[PDB]
């Protein structure tokens, strides 16, 4: 188990192999965080999450 | 939905309802944006004019989230075979946008490769609907949802009397009373990862509902992704 095949290269959501490392992307509604793992979102009742 | 249990508040704002002229549903859907609901392309012939209702998860009471909303256009896949219900997927464009709230927000679309190594590969997806709770029965009046084990390839094609195309997967139990079922046709299957809800199928069919040696064929959305992308840019 390597990059993305280890714990989903600890990104939140998709998780590219580029390189040979590990590069972590968001749905749409969503920005990369500064750390470039997690997701957050840029608004309100973003995609996929259970309201309230 | 046969088995499950009920979508409590907020846990299936995905959800969308395709209704007839009489305000009854016959098939599900799943909001993917303000505009654009996901639904079954077979779902496109059991009504000659419907709406798509959403946030609603009891169809005896007004509790205040719901909202119908009119069609604009209809996005079917032009390879939809009533053969085999290969290629079985539509997009519907809302004449007006939906207004996220309390019941009513998005699934996630993912991307393919990731999707397929890393949610289709998950134990379970979540298949959600207000469809009937017995084969015999009639359609629930309470939406439902219901944890799917996602079914070896090989063995559901053994356990199927017709083809599985590239463009289907199997979900559900061998032999535990727990399916979609009539009326969950076009609806959402999900997965589940850290906490986000991802859309990875659609209610295809089914050999009856829940039976033995028999598991409920779902639209392989993954398959799909740049078709979905498209048709939402027009
Ligand atoms: C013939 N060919 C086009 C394909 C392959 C065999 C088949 C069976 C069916 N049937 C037969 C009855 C059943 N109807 S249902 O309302 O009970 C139903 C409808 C959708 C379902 C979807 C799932 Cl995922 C599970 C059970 C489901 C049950 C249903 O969907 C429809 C299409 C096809
Ligand atoms: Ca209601
Ligand atoms: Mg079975």
């Known amino acids: 188990r390597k990059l993305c095949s280890l714990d989903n290269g600890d990104c939140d959501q998709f998780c590219h192999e580029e390189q040979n490392s590990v590069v972590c992307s968001c749905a749409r509604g969503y920005t990369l965080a500064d750390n470039g793992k997690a997701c957050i979102p840029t608004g309100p009742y973003p995609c996929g999450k259970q309201t309230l | 939905i046969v088995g499950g249990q009920e979508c409590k508040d907020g846990e299936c704002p995905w959800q969308a309802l395709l209704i007839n002229e009489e305000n009854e549903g016959f098939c599900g859907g799943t909001i993917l944006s303000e505009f654009y609901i996901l639904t079954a392309a077979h779902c496109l012939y059991q009504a000659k004019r419907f709406k798509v209702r959403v946030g609603d998860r009891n169809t005896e009471q007004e509790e205040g989230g719901e909202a119908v909303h009119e069609v604009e256009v209809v996005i079917k896949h032009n390879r939809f075979t009533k053969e085999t219900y290969d290629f079985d997927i539509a997009v519907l464009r809302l004449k007006t946008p939906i207004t996220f709230r309390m019941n009513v927000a998005p699934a996630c679309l993912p991307e393919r490769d ?15 609907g207000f469809g009937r709770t017995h084969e015999k029965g009639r359609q629930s009046t309470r939406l439902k949802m219901l944890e799917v084990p996602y079914v070896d390839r090989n063995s559901c094609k053994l356990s199927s009397s017709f083809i599985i195309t590239q463009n289907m997967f199997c979900a559900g139990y061998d032999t535990k ?51 979905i992308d498209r048709s939402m840019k027009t």
């Open chain 2, 177 to 227: 009373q727990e399916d979609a079922c009539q009326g969950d046709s076009g609806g959402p299957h999900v997965t589940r990862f850290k906490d986000t809800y991802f859309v990875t199928g659609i209610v295809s069919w089914g050999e009856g509902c829940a039976r033995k040696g028999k598991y409920g064929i779902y639209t392989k959305v993954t398959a799909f992704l740049k078709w």
């Open chain 2, 114 to 128: 990731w999707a397929e190594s890393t949610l289709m590969t998950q134990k379970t997806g979540i298949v959600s």
